Structures are given as structure tokens and as C-alpha cells.
Design a binder for this molecule. Structure first.
Ligand code: I3A
Ligand code: I3A
Ligand code: I3A
Ligand code: I3A
Ligand code: I3A
Ligand code: I3A
Ligand code: I3A
Ligand code: I3A
Lengths: 211, 211, 210, 206, 211, 211
């Protein structure tokens, strides 16, 4: 439909992409890739992503993978529709770079820690597996250090990259949606600017659509 | 009043108990425990099982947990109805002990491997998590060694504990139902007596009822 | 007669040895040399194809799995020595209560106790340093299990009711090892658990295998 | 002017250095003394609150994260020196293809490469199942790259871009280890490695 | 009070000492140190070795620890009895140095690898533990490199340090005794001079005495 | 062709050999082996040491490797000049054995811990890495235990092996020289006899020559 997302609706990375599409009011098809049958590890999925992970993506003839490459593509290709996901002046190179810092930070500092915490507290427990409280304590200490940085940043700017909501903020949303269903929620709540930021970005309609 | 199972219909350990109840043609209520909401790790479920695992069980005033304690209770308490889940001569101590060996083998050698395989290949998939191929390969190698023993055992006896279907066999059923939906199925099909045994125990009406 | 094929230091072998001594039975302990891999060779594999001690014989009856063997002992020799079943052994409900305990020992206690023994006792023989993070993690798990036992022992003298049973007996060999480690504090800080440990480990059948 | 706050041996610092040399830019490398924890104290923390090298300045613009800095260089100084973007840099589809490769370097290659390089350099020089596990992972990655380089000269298309550049410093270190065989075993990967590591900007930081 | 060894008859390091004593036809008393009870980490053992490792050793008033310091002591103190464990001309400094290279090699290159392999393949099994096949493959690759050097060396010389059996060879015996009971044996058997050397040093009466 | 050391002047193991040569006032050539370029893992270095570690060594026709085999060779071959590195009565077998204990202790208890602490705190920097404070704390706890033993030993004797400076002491010098440049220095200064011993052995002219 121009646009197809090959993913899984529960996947943090698939949700990143979905949220960006909804922000742009785009029409698309979500094709739910059957992980139980190893569809991700077979042709033709492997021709969309030779690493065999979700999501992959198509916009007409253009074939992409890696969620953050896809969201950037959406933000540029559909720049003049829906929510602007770039900086207000998107051609300003120095402002772009400031947003790029935040995108890197999300990827390196936030996402791995948030992903472990979600797995330990949500995914495991639903089986009968016992959440490893030492992993949870270690990862929460890391996440608290990250969120202390975010708190200081959000004292100076409304959103992470400046005055407006961008890809930097968007990329956090799916992991945060999951963590708000765990006791790790307290880390967000106890930091007042972080708490306001979380409340704002998770109440967006595009965010609620994928939840 | 009457028999109640506190569990989840998809849970392997809950199904173990359900299958034994249906083999005895017993009426009961399945009281749903919502694992996705962590109900198994909250009161009042914790007052039925302080370890927070489904199932728990009630038969009038008798309160139980641990699926295999529950199935044994069923087999003894309702010995003279429905399918005999004990040995043909249930008062024969030496024959009981042989079945007990099989129960122990299921619990120690089969179940922890089968559970890991189901979790890796089925349960992870449902939440958009990627199966750890090294865990799968390691656990299939272990399962193949266990099934080689079963093959040798089933060359001598129709079922694991002797000439008749017993708890020893029943305890395997739910894990095997799940593994038949994965590529681990080949481990059962490539061993001819194991294959016949699987076909027989999974086609029983009580087995099909929980599936 | 009765033979146990095992090793006298083995937790699982000791379970069976304790049960035999509780019944005042005669038997032979046929040593299986684990350090030489004798458990992974014929003829031991023909007694237990999974290559774990103990295996067992009572005349023509051949068994393996320690907890199947102890149950067999408790039933076969029910009217002699210590009763290892509930006082009324034909009471099905009471049997089920003991069975819960036996399942809990096997699933919740034993794997944790076995890690803690390995980290704190057996690593040291071999020149390995105990991983203090494993020990802290496993002690947190054991404490949770022992909290359940404490609550249980506030209501009942032993785990399954008023009398010593297989539920208690199955714990003895792991506990004997853990008492030689700082994990002892977990037992001593819980008063009913502490009493229960003192009682079960001072039994003559327990002291025999130590 | 341009300043890099970092350490000359740091893989992430070298990424930035290479991009600067590719643009023929003048800059100052201000050494951050990792051994003394300078990266975890003020004033470095006011340049990067996460306490990692490198940080960066171009006049009043203050940055951190190596891959944000190299992108900035590639755009701000686009028309000078080597083009580090695609030939047609305003082509959105082609940019996206390069972006995929940049994500792949960061998520699939770098974590494996860096650990392997570090394990074996220190096994080799200082005597300190990680290498086998990581080489198996790297081989899988390089199998994908081999297939990709059968179709295209460089990872993102017909020209050298940031996608390729980001790999250089980790590859420099791995070429000093037995892991080198993984590159030499795969003919297109081998030619690609030989080309990117022989560039004058790459040799400058080595 | 003559010679005493404070140790354990299964301990590799204890056996090193035992073999050297038997080679010299010395009488002694093996005083058992109960490792399972932590006797090696208590007084009075700690007054014999403050590092709490077996063996410790006494020869009249002389108190020693560290197996390789002990074997050298035995080799020198009892030089003119039994097997010569030094070079034929024991005052030849350059020949001594060649033996000393070998002793260092055994300690640094062979022993740590051989020990890991023994632990993974023999001792883990005693507890319920599964052998880590990745550690075994990594360590065998290391051991194969070491044994390639030994093969080259044994092409030129009958034993590792020259024409005669010395401490260099003796120090390897106990670890080799254990490894011959594992699949690592193939490393020795596939290298013909190494294989002959193993056969010769393990079949010595002093070696068989401790086995 | 005289004495040659094949090594690197910064290397702890090379320095051990250099210090011994300087204690004996020997002339020699240090032939540079470029570790940064992997010269130690190529021919012709491998034909001096097939394990690929510095240093290797030559004294005329005699070819050696392993720093502690070399220092022993120097101590014996040149026993008759410069500093005596053996015990005062070098033919006393018991006294030799006591020194041998200390050499084994330096190699097994001290060196691996001291080498790790130097790597974490000094040499990580060279590759742009950050020091892991948890490794430093763990290794300092180990080193403190070792130095407590040394403190007790040095209450009884002036040096580790008795009244006089020997190989036992010398082997520690290069690791100590590096650790004195780090916060780990406090472990040595906290322990009064250890502190004196460090001050004495590091102020020796042969020690100062290799810095
Ligand atoms: O200028 C287009 C652009 C910049 N960054 C990205 C990333 C992904 C697709 C396109 C683009
Ligand atoms: O998004 C831009 C940014 C700049 N400094 C920080 C720090 C932490 C998160 C984001 C950012
Ligand atoms: O069920 C009894 C039994 C006896 N020996 C074995 C062996 C393997 C599985 C089951 C059994
Ligand atoms: O042995 C009986 C028993 C019943 N419920 C529990 C719970 C915990 C340990 C033991 C038991
Ligand atoms: O650089 C772009 C690119 C697209 N697909 C792949 C796959 C593997 C490495 C890089 C790339
Ligand atoms: O020649 C005596 C001696 C004792 N230990 C060593 C070590 C190295 C060379 C020679 C010697
Ligand atoms: O035992 C002496 C020796 C000399 N060079 C080597 C090398 C490898 C093993 C032993 C030896
Ligand atoms: O050098 C001899 C020695 C004897 N016992 C010890 C203990 C600790 C270090 C060295 C020594």
C-alpha cells in the first residue's frame, strides 16, 4: 500500500516504525512475520533482511531494514505531512547534529538497558521464570544514571533535542510503554521533567495506536 | 465445593492436571489465573501457592499445588473411576516403584529440556523475541539422548512403566503437544517406538480436550 | 539382598542410605568411582542409562533415581523401623500433602542448595574461587524457600505434619553440607527452620552417613 | 575552530579523526587522560554527561557520540575533500540505504569486533571461550558483507561512504590479530578491507 | 619424624610430589587433608601453607609447600638415590637451564590448560554439571599447539629436556593421567613421539603407584 | 656472540631479565621486539620462542626463553660476580628450597594479580579503554591477602627467602615499579615491613636502570 512493514506487533523495534508512520498519517500494511515458523530465517524474508530480524520495510520499490534507518527515511521522505519528526528547521545542520546525538544516546545508553528490564520483568515472569532481581537492580541503577542525564537535559529544553518532539523522543516510546507496566515506572515518576516528558510522549495518539 | 484448578489453559503444568481430571471423567472448574497481568505473583494466588506457579488445586477442603503431586492425588483418590492411571495392580509395590522411576525421569531428564525448548521456540516467538539458536541446539542434543533411552525402553514395553498407560506417560503429554508444533518434532518422528508412543498418547480424548 | 551403587559423599546416594538406616535394613554400598567416570561406563550404565548415582537393587528389583528408591523403601518396609510415610499411610489426602513437600524439595530447594554447596565447598577442592555474586543470588532464592518453610513449621512440627517423613528426609544430605558453609546463617536466623534442621541432622541415621 | 576531545587509540575517537582527515580539515586533538578518569570528571562531563570519548567542538557547536560527529562532518563540509555521503546526497532513497549500513555497523559489527580485537590483543601482548564465540558471530556478519560486496563496490553502493568509514578503526585493530583470517578468507571482504585501510586518512590515525 | 606429605591422593599437585618420592624409593607418610571440610583453609594447615593449597611437606625440620619447589628439593637432596631426576650431569649449568625452560613451560603453558580440560570433562560430571563444549574446544586448540611444540622437541630428544627422564617430564604425569581418561586423549595419540613419551612416563612404576 | 635479550623495554617479563643482568654488571644487547606489530607472533621470533612471548635470550650458543628460567640461569652461570642472587650459601639444599617456594609464590600468587592491576590501571589507557573499577577492587582484595602473607614473612626475615636479597625478591620488582605509579601503591605503603622491602628493592641501582 505503498508502504509495508514486515514485523511483529509486540516488537519494540517494529513499534518504533509504526509510531513514525502514524505520526505522518500514512497508510500502510503490517505483515505479521511468523517467528514460530522461522519465517524470519527463510527466503523470501532474508532477501528483505539478511540478518533475519524484524522489522523490514518497503515503500514501493525501496526495501529497508533497521528500525532507526526506517524512521529516518519516513521523517525525510514524508517531511511535509503530519507531524514534523525533524527539527523545526530541518535543513539546519547544527540542529540536526544535536538531534543525532540524542538518537545515538537512545540507541546506546537507553535501549539495551530498557530491553533487559522489560525481558526480566515482563517477558520472563509470564512464563514461570523467576525474574533475576540482581539483573533488575543492576539495570535500574544504569537506567537511573541515564535518566539523571535526561532530567538535566529536560530542565533546559522541552524535548530531548530542543523545543519540539522529534525522532529522538519517538525512538524511546515503545520501550517506555513496556516499562510503565513494571515497578521500573518509579524511575520515571521520581524525576519531574522526565515524568512530564513520558506523560506527553506516551499520550500522543500515534503512541496509543500501537499500544 | 468440588474440584477447582487455578491455572491457565495454555500452561504445560496446568494441562498436566487437566488431562488427569479428564482421564478420570471428573467435573471441575478451571479458575483462570491471568499470567500476562502477573496474577500468579500476587495475592490471593500466592496464598494458594507461595511459589507463584500455576496450577494450584482444591478438592473440597484439600488445597494442593505442584502439578505432579495433584495428578498423583487424582490417580489415588479417584482410582476406581475412569482410566486407571496407576499400574494394573496398584498395590504391587515393586511395579509402583518402576512407574516412580519413570515419573522421576520425566521430571528430571525430560521436562527441564522440553520446557526450555518450548520457551525458546514458541513462547519467545509470541512476544516478538528472537530464539537463541545455541540454546535450541544444545537442548535438542540433550533431548535426543533422553529419547534414545525412551526408544530402548519402549522396545521392551508398550508404555514407559510397563504394558499400560500410566502417570509416567501422562506427565509428558503437554510438553510434547507443544513440541510437535516446532522443528523439535523430528526428534520424536525419527525414533519409531517413540513416534508410535507419541501418536498414541496425544490422540487420547483427554489429551485432545486440552489442546 | 539390598545393594546401593553409589558414592558415600554423593547427596543423592546419602538420601537412599539414610532411608535404609531409618528402616534398620542391611545392605551393601557398592562404590562407584565418579572421579574415574565409572558412572558413565558399562556396567553402571546398564543399571542407570542416565549415568547418575545411585542405582539400587533389592533382590531382582532394579531401580534408579534416589527419590523413587526412598519411596520404595518407605512402602516395601513400611512396618519396620521408622515410619517414613504419614502416620496413617493409607490416608490419601495426607499422602498428597507429603507429596507437595517432596515436589517442593526437588524443585525449589535442591537445585539452589546444590549450587550453593558447589560454589562454597566443591569449587575450593579444585583451585577455584567462589563467585560471591552466585552465592548472594542463590542465598536470596534459598531465603525465600526457607521463609515458606518457616511459615509451614509454625503450624506443623515437620514439613508434612506432626511427624518426620520422606519430605524432611530428602533434605538432609544437602543440609549436612550447607551447615559447613556461611549459608548456615539462613537456617539459624529462622527459629523453627533452625530447630527442624537441628532435629533432622541429629537423627542417628543422619549421623551414620556424615 | 575544530577540536576533538579524546584519545588517539580509542576506536570511537579514530572514527571522528578519519572523517576529519578525509575532509582535509585542520583540528586540534585534545587528549583526555582515561587512566586518570578525566572522562568521568568535570569539566569533561559538561561536554559529555555520559563520560565517553570523544567529545567535539566546531566553533560554538558542541557534540558527542562519534557517529553523530562524523555525520555532522559529512554534511557541514560536504563539498570539500572526500564525499562521505552518497554521490547524490539529496537522494532520499540512497541516503536510507547508507543509513541501513550505518545501523548494521553499529548493531551487528562493532560490538563483536571491538570485543574480539580487545580480547586478543590483550591475550597476545599481556597473557590475559570468548574468541571462538565472537569469531563465529563475526563470520556470519562477514558472510552477509561478502554477499553485499558481490553486488556493490562498497557497502552502501558504488562509492566509499560513512558506512565503510565507521568500520575502519575496529578493522585496523583486528588486522593485528589472528581474526584477520576471517577477512582474508572472503575475497570481496578482503578487497574492501585492503581498499579502506590503505586510504591516506586511515593510515594517518593508525 | 621423617618425610611427610600433607595433601590428598587425588590432587594433581599432591601426586607430583608423591611420584618424585617413589622415584627416589623414599619412605614417607601421606597425611590426608580433608578438602571437602575446608581443612586446607584452617589452622593448623595454614601454618604449613598460608595460601591454603595442598600439598605441604616436611622432611625432618624442613617445612615446604608448592609442589614444584618440593620436587626440586627431592631431586637435589636425594640426588644419589633412586632415579636421577636432574640432568645426567647435574652440575652442567647450561643443561640445567634447558630443563628449567621445560619446567616453566609445563607450569605456564600445559598445566592451566590441562586443568581446565580435566575440570570440564571429569570433575563437573561428579556434581551434576554439564561440560561446556566451547571451553573444551578452546582448551584443546591451546593444548594441541602446546603438544605440537612437544612433538617437535621429542623428534630431537628422547625426553623434553634431553636424553633422560627429568623433573620436566615428571611434572606433567598427574594431569596426563587424568586426561587419558577423557576424549582429550586423542591429542596425545595422534602425535607419535608425544604418544610414545606419554606411554613411557605413565607406565613407570612410580606413576602407576599414585594412579 | 655475547649476551642478547630479545624483548621490549616496557615488558614486565623482559625487565626481570634486564634487572638480573644489571645486578651481575653484565654487558649485553637488548634487541627490540615490536609487540605492537605482532613481531613476537612471527618468524624469526617464533624460532627463539615457539610460544611467542618476550623475552627470549642468548648467551653465546645457549638459547633460552621464560623470564624465570633465564634469571635462574644468570644467577647460576654468573654466580661468582656482582650481586649474589642465590642464597648466601648456594649449595645449601634446604635454603635453596625455601627460595624456590618464594619464586613459586611470586609466579602463582602475586604476578597474575599484579599484572591484572597494572593492565587495568595503566595499559588499558594505551588502547583508549576505561579502567573497570570492579576488577580493580577485586584484584586489590586479592593483592592485599598476598601482601598480608608477605608482611608476616618480612616480620621474620629481612627479605622473602631469608637474610639477603635473592631472585625471589628480584622477580617482583618490575610489576611493583608499575604499581607504585597507581593508587594500588597504598597496599604497599599501609604495611610497614612490605613498605620498607619495596623501598629497598626499587632503589637498587639495577632496578632504577630499567625504568
Ligand atoms: O537526507 C536524507 C536523510 C538524512 N538521513 C536519512 C536517514 C534515512 C533516510 C534518509 C535520510
Ligand atoms: O537529543 C539531544 C541530546 C543532546 N544531549 C543529550 C543528552 C541526553 C539525551 C539527549 C541529548
Ligand atoms: O517408567 C519407568 C521407567 C523405568 N525405566 C525407565 C527409563 C526411562 C523412562 C522410564 C522408565
Ligand atoms: O510437606 C508438605 C508441604 C506442604 N506444603 C508445603 C510447602 C512447602 C514445603 C513443604 C510443604
Ligand atoms: O550499507 C548498506 C547496506 C545495505 N544492506 C546491507 C547489509 C549489510 C551491510 C551493509 C548494508
Ligand atoms: O645449575 C643450577 C641451576 C639450578 N636452577 C637453575 C635454573 C636455570 C639454570 C641453572 C640452574
Ligand atoms: O624441557 C625443556 C624444554 C626446552 N624447550 C622446551 C620447549 C617445550 C617444552 C619443553 C622444553
Ligand atoms: O621465599 C620464601 C618464602 C617462604 N615462604 C613464603 C611465603 C610468601 C612469600 C615467600 C615465601
Amino acid at each position: 500500500a505503498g508502504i509495508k512493514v514486515f514485523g511483529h506487533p509486540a516488537s519494540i523495534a517494529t513499534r518504533r516504525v509504526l509510531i513514525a508512520l502514524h505520526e505522518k498519517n500514512l497508510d500502510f500494511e503490517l505483515v505479521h512475520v511468523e517467528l514460530k515458523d522461522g519465517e524470519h530465517k527463510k527466503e523470501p524474508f532474508l532477501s528483505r533482511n539478511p540478518f533475519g530480524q524484524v522489522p523490514a520495510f518497503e515503500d514501493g520499490d525501496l526495501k529497508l531494514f533497521e528500525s532507526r534507518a526506517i524512521t529516518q527515511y519516513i521523517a525525510h521522505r514524508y517531511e511535509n505531512q503530519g507531524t514534523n519528526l525533524l527539527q523545526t528547521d530541518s535543513k539546519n545542520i547544527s540542529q540536526y547534529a544535536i538531534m543525532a546525538i540524542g538518537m545515538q544516546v537512545e540507541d546506546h545508553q537507553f535501549d539495551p538497558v530498557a530491553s533487559k528490564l522489560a525481558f526480566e520483568q515482563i517477558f520472563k515472569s509470564i512464563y514461570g521464570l523467576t525474574t533475576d532481581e540482581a539483573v533488575v537492580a543492576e539495570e535500574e541503577a544504569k537506567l537511573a544514571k541515564v535518566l539523571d542525564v535526561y532530567e538535566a537535559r529536560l530542565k533546559e529544553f522541552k524535548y530531548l533535542a530542543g523545543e519540539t518532539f522529534t525522532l529522538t523522543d519517538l525512538h524511546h516510546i515503545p520501550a517506555i510503554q513496556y516499562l510503565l507496566g513494571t515497578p521500573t515506572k518509579k524511575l520515571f515518576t521520581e524525576r519531574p521533567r522526565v515524568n512530564e516528558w513520558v506523560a506527553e510522549i506516551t499520550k500522543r495518539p500515534a503512541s496509543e495506536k500501537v499500544q
